[PDB]
Design an enzyme around this catalytic site. Structure first.
Site, PDB file in Angstrom:
ATOM      1  N   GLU B  40       0.871  -1.169   0.000  1.00 32.00           N
ATOM      2  CA  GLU B  40       0.000   0.000   0.000  1.00 32.00           C
ATOM      3  C   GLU B  40       0.920   1.234   0.000  1.00 32.00           C
ATOM      4  O   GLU B  40       1.620   1.468   0.966  1.00 32.00           O
ATOM      5  CB  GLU B  40      -0.891  -0.013   1.225  1.00 32.00           C
ATOM      6  CG  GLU B  40      -1.878   1.103   1.283  1.00 32.00           C
ATOM      7  CD  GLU B  40      -2.535   1.170   2.634  1.00 32.00           C
ATOM      8  OE1 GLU B  40      -2.793   0.114   3.258  1.00 32.00           O
ATOM      9  OE2 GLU B  40      -2.799   2.305   3.077  1.00 32.00           O
ATOM     10  N   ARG B  44       0.286  10.303   0.501  1.00 30.85           N
ATOM     11  CA  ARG B  44       0.578  11.315   1.506  1.00 30.85           C
ATOM     12  C   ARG B  44       1.797  12.139   1.146  1.00 30.85           C
ATOM     13  O   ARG B  44       2.164  13.026   1.889  1.00 30.85           O
ATOM     14  CB  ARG B  44       0.815  10.655   2.870  1.00 30.85           C
ATOM     15  CG  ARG B  44      -0.425  10.009   3.466  1.00 30.85           C
ATOM     16  CD  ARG B  44      -0.095   9.469   4.842  1.00 30.85           C
ATOM     17  NE  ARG B  44      -1.035   8.430   5.270  1.00 30.85           N
ATOM     18  CZ  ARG B  44      -0.783   7.532   6.224  1.00 30.85           C
ATOM     19  NH1 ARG B  44       0.381   7.575   6.863  1.00 30.85           N
ATOM     20  NH2 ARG B  44      -1.669   6.591   6.517  1.00 30.85           N
ATOM     21  N   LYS B 127     -11.324  -2.026   6.265  1.00 30.64           N
ATOM     22  CA  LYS B 127     -10.132  -1.741   7.037  1.00 30.64           C
ATOM     23  C   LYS B 127     -10.678  -1.187   8.314  1.00 30.64           C
ATOM     24  O   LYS B 127     -11.508  -0.355   8.300  1.00 30.64           O
ATOM     25  CB  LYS B 127      -9.372  -0.631   6.289  1.00 30.64           C
ATOM     26  CG  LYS B 127      -8.183   0.086   6.941  1.00 30.64           C
ATOM     27  CD  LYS B 127      -6.868  -0.204   6.191  1.00 30.64           C
ATOM     28  CE  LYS B 127      -6.519  -1.708   6.284  1.00 30.64           C
ATOM     29  NZ  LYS B 127      -5.364  -2.262   5.509  1.00 30.64           N
TER      30      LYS B 127
END
Lengths: 207, 207, 206
Positions: B40, B44, B127
């Site tokens: 993943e 960001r 999640k």
């Protein structure tokens, strides 16, 4: 004046529950004398809109409404002269309306889906509520590090002892608290002293 | 490849923050050599979509995007070659769009309403985020026993010490963590060793 | 019968997971003999709608469905004879449908946005879930003091030891719990005794 500016005026945003309209002027005067000009009057008592109209007459007071649960209440609080609006949570309705109305809304978030909805509506300043019961500073840091563009005011269970820890985090522009207006009979001296104490809290954030 | 299959490939899904594009290939190679094929890359950092395009060239790497806040970011991550998408929470918009786009979205949930909104959109893998700040395993067990058809990947504060406890629960297909790519300068040997360690975690859900 | 009335009937609302249809009648009988007439049968097992149909035949039983995730499941639970519906959370869809259908829905809330959505739909009674994992009584007090018109049933991790603390708060009408139907083989005597014990909890609200 937009909500980010309101958040930067003072380190602590008193959360007021006005049980008696006689108390409104003295509480507001005492807070303002103490250097806490930004007053959240919660819409949790029936006399709250009168109280707002009274505090609004106090020079230096920047009066907002809390506990705004929907668009209706936001419209009423606006008519009454509120400069900003705080809600414990966010709904798409309240948000769309605040944006449409150019209202400085500071809505509550508790988790990522809340912030994300906020972001989708064009909002990026949120109240983290009720802070101490939903993970505290650790939870807020986790959110802050994911939503870098967002800034917070944590409210809920914050005290003079914990407030400076929150204010050391630059993602936090101020904290909300009711410890500043204690008991239920107003002691103008005590309030002013607690407000001075609180208005001198250092913040990491550029205020 | 649908999201449930991605979740079963490996016990741990490394959550990568790539600060320097030079680091993308070596990190991805090291993780894959270590048996952690599913990566993943969080959106960001400014170089994140390049990094994805690089790791995507690494054989065996199954690269996804994290920190997908909205449909725009999802579309960008897709254009870039992402095979799946992780978000910290779920909005109806991001969800309807992922489904419409046949995108393997793994959205964050923090409470039952979030899961319920997921289920309504036709999603059943979530999640749980940020796990350790919203109740941890005890909270996740409560959810899991209510939503029997749903499976989870907890992320948020998980460590090598706590990961096997989450992985004992058969509702949990894998966990996310960043402990596997430490510091900020890549040590291919250290990464591969931590990945081997983590790829050998037992899971109740997957033999 | 509206949801606020269901909540007031008894201090504890058993949350039942029926793993074997043979257990439905005896469980319901035992609970009812014990003074817990209000039964939430969760829709978490494949035999749950049969179980509801069975418990519904038990005299003195007020049977509801839990774990109602959507409008479809609500409609099925209704057809099966449920008198009220519990969900772990609230969606606008499930809410709108319950309201439209005049169904006594008790939906789950975990934070203010949830309650606010409820209030927007006309609902003011919520299940606070899963209580012990999302802040417990302290968190619930914080909510209660903001939403003064709202009343709650906390469920999730509540025990005989903690239930009376929740019930001392007048914003709480009752609690949900599974401790009353233990293990997985029904002991009618144990169940009835635990139900008597629980039916005698004092509540500030009632």
């Amino acid at each position: 004046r937009d909500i980010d500016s309101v958040m930067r005026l003072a380190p602590v945003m008193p959360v007021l529950v006005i049980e008696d309209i006689a108390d409104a002027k003295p509480i507001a005067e005492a807070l303002v004398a103490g250097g806490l000009n930004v007053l959240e009057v919660t819409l949790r008592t029936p006399c709250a809109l009168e109280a707002i109209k009274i505090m609004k007459e106090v020079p230096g007071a920047v009066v907002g409404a809390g506990t705004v649960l929907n668009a209706k209440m936001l419209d009423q609080a606006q008519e009454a002269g509120c400069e900003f609006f705080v809600s414990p949570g966010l709904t798409a309705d309240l948000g769309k309306h605040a944006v449409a109305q150019k209202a400085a809304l500071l809505p509550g978030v508790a988790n990522a889906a809340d912030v994300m909805l906020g972001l989708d509506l064009g909002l990026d300043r949120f109240k983290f509520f009720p802070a101490e019961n939903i993970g505290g500073l650790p939870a807020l840091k986790s959110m802050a590090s994911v939503f870098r563009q967002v800034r917070f005011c944590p409210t809920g269970g914050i005290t003079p002892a914990s407030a400076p820890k929150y204010l050391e985090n630059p993602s936090i522009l101020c904290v909300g608290g009711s410890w500043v207006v204690p008991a239920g009979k107003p002691d103008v001296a005590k309030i002013t002293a607690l407000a001075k104490e609180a208005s001198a809290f250092k913040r990491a954030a550029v205020a």
